[PDB]
Amino acid sequence: GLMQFTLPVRLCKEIELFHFDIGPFENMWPGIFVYMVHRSCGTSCFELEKLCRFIMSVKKNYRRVPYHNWKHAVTVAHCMYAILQNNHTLFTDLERKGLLIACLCHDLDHRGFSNSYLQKFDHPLAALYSTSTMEQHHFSQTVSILQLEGHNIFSTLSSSEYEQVLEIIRKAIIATDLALYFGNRKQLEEMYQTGSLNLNNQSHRDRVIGLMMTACDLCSVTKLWPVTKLTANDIYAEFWAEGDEMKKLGIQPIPMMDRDKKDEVPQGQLGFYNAVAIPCYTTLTQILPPTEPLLKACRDNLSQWEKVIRGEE
Numbered sequence: 001g002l003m004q005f006t007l008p009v010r011l012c013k014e015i016e017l018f019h020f021d022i023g024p025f026e027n028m029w030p031g032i033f034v035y036m037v038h039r040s041c042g043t044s045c046f047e048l049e050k051l052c053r054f055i056m057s058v059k060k061n062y063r064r065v066p067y068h069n070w071k072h073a074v075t076v077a078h079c080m081y082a083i084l085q086n087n088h089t090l091f092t093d094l095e096r097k098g099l100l101i102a103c104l105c106h107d108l109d110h111r112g113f114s115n116s117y118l119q120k121f122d123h124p125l126a127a128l129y130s131t132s133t134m135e136q137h138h139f140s141q142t143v144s145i146l147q148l149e150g151h152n153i154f155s156t157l158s159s160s161e162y163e164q165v166l167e168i169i170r171k172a173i174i175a176t177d178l179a180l181y182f183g184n185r186k187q188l189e190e191m192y193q194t195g196s197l198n199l200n201n202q203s204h205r206d207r208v209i210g211l212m213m214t215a216c217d218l219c220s221v222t223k224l225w226p227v228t229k230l231t232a233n234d235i236y237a238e239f240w241a242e243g244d245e246m247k248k249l250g251i252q253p254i255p256m257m258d259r260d261k262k263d264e265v266p267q268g269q270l271g272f273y274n275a276v277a278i279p280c281y282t283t284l285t286q287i288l289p290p291t292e293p294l295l296k297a298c299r300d301n302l303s304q305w306e307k308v309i310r311g312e313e
């Protein structure tokens with residue numbers, strides 16, 4: 001009860017900033033997450049014994065893939081932490097509980113392959129879940145781990161609160177399917193501009209939470225340039241592996257996944273910042289003004305990719 005987690009001074013200060021990098025010391029990441037839960041939610045939200053057992057089971061169920069790994073999980077939970085801390089009063093006690101856990105669990109048991117590759121391979125998960133294939137798997141893995149003896153961190157919630165938190169987590173995890181992001185942001189853009197956006201409307205909050213999940217999931221684009229640049233290497237290590245596997249199935253992959261077209265990465269990055277990242281953080285900044293530092297860091301990185309094309313780096 002009276003046991004806090006305490007970070008070294010540099011981490012204690014920088015963890016509050018949107019652009020914090022969680023560092024290369026894996027053994028500190030669990031403590032960083034508990035620190036964020038305690039400050040974001042309270043030291044009472046979860047039994048520490050159960051949270052620690054949940055965190056370590058979640059870690060064990062992430063694989064050793066270049067990008068969709070345990071570091072990504074914690075990184076995405078930190079961006080959510082930064083959004084929740086800068087928007088103190090806008091979110092219910094249940095939402096703060098659910099969303100950090102959603103972010104930690106959102107890519108559970110990822111193999112480093114897209115929903116497209118699962119479908120073309122004819123992987124069993126593609127038979128079980130026809131759309132948002134991996135994302136339904138991630139939520140399913142989350143429920144499994146919550147039901148391990150000693151792992152139910154929500155046990156002190158009432159039955160209805162329990163049903164509400166699992167519904168927040170489910171929608172939050174499904175929303176990380178980038179195919180669903182385009183239509184979700186368009187709807188939110190319309191609602192904000194015609195002034196119909198109403199955060200007491202549950203279907204509207206769902207949409208806003210969905211956009212928060214895209215923002216946290218993509219947050220490598222909101223870091224210092226060297227973090228952004230080095231994360232992109234890991235993202236392409238997965239994409240090019242998938243392209244290799246597409247070739248093995250006798251299918252030429254899209255240029256994004258074809259290691260033979262590395263040369264065009266910078267232009268692909270521009271398309272992505274213009275089509276996905278900038279519009280995401282722009283609408284997010286309109287709805288939640290204190291998340292502006294994410295939009296500003298994203299535009300800075302767009303500028304860095306423009307400089308790469310111009311041969312200046």
Ligand SMILES: Cc1ccccc1-c1cn2c(n1)C[C@H](NC(=O)c1c(C(=O)N3CCC3)cnn1C)CC2
Nearest residue numbers: 178218220221235255256261262264265268269272
């Ligand atoms: C057109 C092209 C030609 C030649 C070479 C490359 C490209 C190209 C097109 N695109 C990209 N490269 C990367 C971009 N996606 C990211 O950069 C990305 C993700 C992300 O899409 N997801 C899914 C799982 C992670 C997460 N964060 N970031 C930064 C998507 C579009």
Ligand SMILES: [Mg+2]
Nearest residue numbers: 106107134176
């Ligand atoms: Mg995912």
Ligand SMILES: [Zn+2]
Nearest residue numbers: 106107176217
């Ligand atoms: Zn993710």
